[PDB]
Amino acid sequence: GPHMATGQDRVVALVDMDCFFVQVEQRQNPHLRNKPCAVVQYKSWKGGGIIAVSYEARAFGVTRSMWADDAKKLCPDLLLAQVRESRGKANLTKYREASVEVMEIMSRFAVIERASIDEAYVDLTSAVQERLQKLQGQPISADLLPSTYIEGLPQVQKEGMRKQGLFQWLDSLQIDNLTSPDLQLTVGAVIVEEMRAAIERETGFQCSAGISHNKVLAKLACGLNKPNRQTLVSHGSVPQLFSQMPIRKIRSLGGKLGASVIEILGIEYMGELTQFTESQLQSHFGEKNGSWLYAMCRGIEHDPVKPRQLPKTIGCSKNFPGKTALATREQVQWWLLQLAQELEERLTKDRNDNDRVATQLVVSIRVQGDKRLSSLRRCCALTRYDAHKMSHDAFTVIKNCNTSGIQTEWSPPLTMLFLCATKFSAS
Template sequence: MPIARPAPQAPRVIAHVDLDCFYVQVEQRRRPELRGLPTAVVQYNAWKGGGLIAVGYEARKFGVKRSMRGDEAKMVCPDIQLVQVPVARGKADLNLYRDAGSEVVSILAAKGRCERASIDEVYLDLTAAAEQMLTATPPDTLQEIDEETLKSHVLGLQNGESVKQWLCRTDADHLDRLLACGAVIVAELRAEVLKKTSFTCSAGIAHNKMLAKLASGIHKPAQQTVVPSSSVPDLLGSLPINKMKQLGGKLGSSLQKELGVATVGDLLHFTEEKLQELYGWNTGAWLWNIARGINGDEVEGRLLPKSHGCGKTFPGQQALKSLSVVKHWLNGLCEELSERLQADLDKNKRLAHTLIIHADGSKAQGALTKRKFPSKSCPLRYGTAKIQEDAWKLFESGLREFLDLQSSEWAVTSLSVSASKIFPVPTGTNSIVKYFGEKQQSYSQTSEVCDVYGEDTTSISSSGDHLSEASDLQPVNHFGEENNGCHSPGMTHQTNKCSTVNREKGVCSILEHFHPIRFLKHFPPTVDGGTSGSKDEETESFKNEDAGTSPSHEIQVDQQREIWRFNVEDVDLSIVKELPPEIQQEVQTWIKSSKRTNPAKRPGSSISHYFAPVKKS
């Protein structure tokens, strides 16, 4: 659903950069002998030569279109070069194109806030760079303007005015002068992309994302278009309604049938109140805004994709009709998704939190319900086997809902898995072993383990069909901070609370999450408030346990000489497997080394001893 956002108060310079026939360009760079030849990139399946997914401009001159298949394209253009998309696991592998797109993004991001909208298009907020250029070196002061800038298309030029004259006007308003600076900057960026990657791209420069997106497709390839505010009415007045983003579907069809709207400019005939009455408050306001070229969407500043996904379609006779075949393909998709998630974690230090499965299906004729195959989601667990297991449970749940207790035959025509809610790994995180301490390690009041957690914590549903808000938690841990005023409970009465300042910041010791009753006092208090036995005896007891005792780890506290002890044999390894890989390895090593030392179990060291018995009322 479109969202109506008011126009920003301050002027902006927004560019939309679109790589020309990107898949074809990537293949031509990989195989230089294809340059200048009519070329198209085709799907991996061989039926009728495969479906075209990208057509080079040389092939378009012969009438080749993306809607054609390979055999048909050869009939139109016998000399066309058909390049097949790389294949992995029986489906298209787009990593070659994703990596090439990342090269371009890294160049464009140097001049302003950058939002990667897709594999081959980027939004740029160049407001700060344009303001700086207008102050320091406006276009009218430049001794020479590069040829690429002078080739720009400026909408609405009148009376034979040239592009150079428009760029260098000193009497222009502030908005147009900013756009002129933006045109110079974008031309420089496009030249830089061509130089470093050999890719050409087209661009639109305007005061908002909507207009910039429209402008980038007006003149292609390897060209740029500028949209001054004065040219907006003419641009939208002749723009077909289905060419506007979010108006190519049901909403656009409704506008055409019910209101007789053919172009975006036709919406100017309706008041905002009338549009809101017909389409709701939000959509009506959005329609009123776009008719006037108003769009408040921000460039989000995202260089990396918001989600990862992979899928495959199974049209016609290729439809999947048994659980075993669906599981085969689903496992392959999950394997690819897991590899991409792990690569994102290793390279970009990001973690995904939600696993989603989508499918399209059909049922045998005569089924009473017209229910669509539902999408399902659950918290994401890292690891190929875990993703495969969870995805299969989600599919089974969706299939039961799709069939609606009917035993009719079914077929799956498309299947996809994706991971979303991807956030950076919290900075400052350390090994989980930091929470437990090592041999002879003492924790004083001036050095504590502190965590920062979000306030809104919701438990994760065990059903696997619903997404929990807990997947959004982003803990940030700080270890070894001096004098932070945050101490473990159970030490002294004063150390059971964090300081007021840190409490307001949400900072407290991780030990505060355990109630004091969970800490065993191995040494009874003496009259002077201390403990019987000496510190040396406590340490010695850790070193010299008999062969008949069970291995355990302790946290020793100087002040009260309390020891937090737990049995490593009671550690649930299935929980350990939920931890990030690097922590898993460290904990597994620690547990194995402890078990090799003393494998026998000592009576009275069960983890149940740390919890007080439930009081019967």
Template sequence: MEAATARVVALVDMDCFYVQVEQRLRPELRKKPVVVAQYKTWKGGGIIAVSYEARAFGVSRNMFANDAKKLCADLQIARVREAHGKADLSKYREASVEVMEIMSRFAVVERASIDEVYIDLSDSVRKRIQEMAGRIIPEEALKSTFVHGYPHLQPTEEQNTTKEDLRRLGVQHWLDSLHFGDLRSPELQLTVGAIIVEEMRAAVEEETTFQCSAGISHNKILAKLSCGLNKPNRQTILPQSSVPALFSQLPIGKM
């Protein structure tokens, strides 16, 4: 068990990254149903990125742009440049480099794709915990964080509890359970890792306008799985104690 919880690893995924790159270039596209398509010789081209506004109409990746227009008449289509008959992804790659440079200030990063990065937070977490010297972590330090499996008791439907209410309640219960004097506590290490990722994501948005989601756990697979639990622009801690419950509910296809 000690070996399984020895590291703190995050997976950061840029939300609809190609769409965000296009929206930064054309601010009028923000908060609108937008897709990014490449090659338009067949049915308007294939869609490779979809904004959350467009997803609400049933538009999805790998759909053809002309078919997507039938689902959403107001759909805005941004097109990938072509060079020598091939898709030119240079502006997305350059934007990705911007993000990676910012993230690398906080911890060791490993690019997983143009819009995903794994981060080994282990050393940064240990250093931060020593600097904290046992101080209590305020709830405000985890303002966009969910803790999977918390709160343990879900409110009833009659209580009209929102997802944000549940998030805050879960964070409160999680923080109440921590032993701040135990510097080797895996739960404390995950929490400090989440604080660092909160700071990292805020820096990315401030300097590039790009928003991202993240998962924080003890290895790459768990970080990847937890990243997708509360998108967009949110992050999720997956503690070891919550892994069995997650796996019992997770379709095998997700693995």
């Protein structure tokens, strides 16, 4: 009892932009606002591939990875915006720059960990302590939490249900105990309301957020009420929430490990994991995974919010599917040059912006027939931000993968090329 850690030591939020690329294109082109629309890449094959879908279009069944021609069968009025194409490949600069807008606003409030182009974790523990010292111990008005859901509460319209739950939560809150984890989460949610208001005011972009005691629960919380809402998942809410929560919904369990937990243990839901000892879970899934699962199914996780806003690698890739697979030496060399030129542009901007230089170039390829992301990776020194040198060096390190006897031909044909600059040093 008195010696059992409860994983209530931190306040962590996860902020996730709603249909991010669609919002970027809707900000730029007001004719797309409040419409079923989608963002596509490429255009000639089946109208292009859908990468992002507005909530109006999702109501028709339009999803990511669908071909736009097929999405138009579900939603004939679907509007489309296309990703910029430069040197024959998709160019995502517009969305990376919009991402920086949002991340810089979030960084004013707290240390953030960039998790993807449109997600960041926030460690709010210190900011909460400060706010509890200020204006205390005054009660927290529901007006400070206008878009917050309390998971598990209450207990015929959506907003009435939201407010009934918020009222039940605020009425039970012990506002005189500055160390109450539930109070700390509530103040965390107040700050996240302020952060999300600042993002929307200064960029036009809406987002969702989760607030809890660790990254996994904050990520789970964020998805419970999308879009344009935030959700607080308390430690006390975990047993009911996990009791019907498919294992695959928890971050890192969406793949082979999660499938093996289900198959080996014969369970379906996250809460069912509590019945196993730590040693049992370590025996099936390894020491690290087993300890992690034992704590996580109790709502406890210690992965820190890392202080990192910049990517550790900068990379450029293109797939060559089907009959387009690269099959001549001139083809491989020309596309390596195209990738190297885009990479040079990104690296030179990175060096000016962030005072650092990459020192290693990783070349990844996939060969036709291979189901893996990469069939082969090789690396060489990155000593100059020069596209011709980078592309020549990349060819040098993959040259002898070519099994073809004819010198102008490449066998087996290449279905992906990927150049990645890594091992940054201060500059």
